[PDB]
Amino acid sequence: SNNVPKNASALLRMNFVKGNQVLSGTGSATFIAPNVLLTVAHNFINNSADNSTGEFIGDKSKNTYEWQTPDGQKGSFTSEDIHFYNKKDYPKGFIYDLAVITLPQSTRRQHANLVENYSKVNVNDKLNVYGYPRGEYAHLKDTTVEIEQKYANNTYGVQYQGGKAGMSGGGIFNSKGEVIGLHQNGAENRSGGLILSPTQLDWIRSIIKGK
């Protein structure tokens, strides 16, 4: 499992369509089943005009998205394949910036494991975070947790140095190489991510066990 985190780390390409015009962006995701990706909701949605709900970037019926792994393999998906943890309350905080993508059953990729049991991450813990800042592969090796934020019971944001734009959606890994969280912010307003709660882990597994 030495190379399992790296080889599960996918680049995301997003093509947001509006009318007959398209704008593109990039992000990151992690394979946690042969045909299931973990990522952030904000690769796909943003705040509604009044911040009351999450809302698709571009036209959801026209958008196209793509994943690519380090070995060069790639595949496509659409909005029909995206499962948001909570699109309605997405604007309320990073606790809801969470999404799972179910790819076709013909996708049979090697993947990392979602952690079986929740383990609280503490300040001064060292994490391993993978992603594609500016679309380029990057591994934040043993980056230290400096600040924690309790979003809800057993639901913590953590801050660690290293993230830049494009890395959001990349995986946070424990020392065994299991997925425990995901990177969410690499902008100038503090790099960090979300450590998945027992509830969020169960929800992801419910999506996996549909596949």
Side-chain angles (χ1 to χ4, degrees), residues 111-137:
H111 63 92
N113 301 324
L114 192 67
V115 66
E116 195 177 2
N117 303 114
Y118 169 79
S119 175
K120 167 77 163 54
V121 170
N122 288 359
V123 170
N124 296 320
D125 281 0
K126 291 165 177 294
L127 304 176
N128 283 278
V129 184
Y130 294 71
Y132 294 83
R134 295 183 64 259
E136 306 178 354
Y137 171 81

Side-chain angles (χ1 to χ4, degrees), residues 152-170:
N153 286 342
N154 310 114
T155 313
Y156 285 87
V158 298
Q159 297 185 9
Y160 47 83
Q161 297 183 55
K164 305 285 280 182
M167 189 162 202
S168 298

Side-chain angles (χ1 to χ4, degrees), residues 132-194:
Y132 294 83
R134 295 183 64 259
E136 306 178 354
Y137 171 81
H139 172 200
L140 307 182
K141 184 172 71 177
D142 295 335
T143 181
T144 58
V145 174
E146 297 170 3
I147 295 290
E148 66 178 348
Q149 179 168 357
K150 180 175 184 161
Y151 295 140
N153 286 342
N154 310 114
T155 313
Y156 285 87
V158 298
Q159 297 185 9
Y160 47 83
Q161 297 183 55
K164 305 285 280 182
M167 189 162 202
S168 298
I172 304 179
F173 295 79
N174 65 13
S175 62
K176 294 186 274 294
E178 304 165 325
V179 173
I180 61 172
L182 72 175
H183 191 83
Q184 287 173 320
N185 193 50
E188 317 192 311
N189 62 328
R190 289 300 182 187
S191 163
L194 167 70

Side-chain angles (χ1 to χ4, degrees), residues 30-50:
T30 304
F31 275 101
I32 59 183
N35 66 339
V36 174
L37 294 170
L38 176 74
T39 192
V40 291
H42 77 246
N43 289 324
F44 309 112
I45 63 172
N46 52 25
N47 286 8
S48 64
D50 64 2

Side-chain angles (χ1 to χ4, degrees), residues 14 16 39-48 53-58 60 63 65 79 82-93 96-99:
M14 299 90 71
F16 311 114
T39 192
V40 291
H42 77 246
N43 289 324
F44 309 112
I45 63 172
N46 52 25
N47 286 8
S48 64
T53 182
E55 177 176 332
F56 265 91
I57 304 171
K60 63 175 174 296
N63 297 334
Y65 319 94
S79 71
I82 307 180
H83 306 268
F84 300 99
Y85 179 63
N86 193 337
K87 175 180 176 183
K88 163 60 185 181
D89 294 319
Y90 166 83
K92 297 289 175 289
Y96 304 117
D97 189 6
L98 171 59

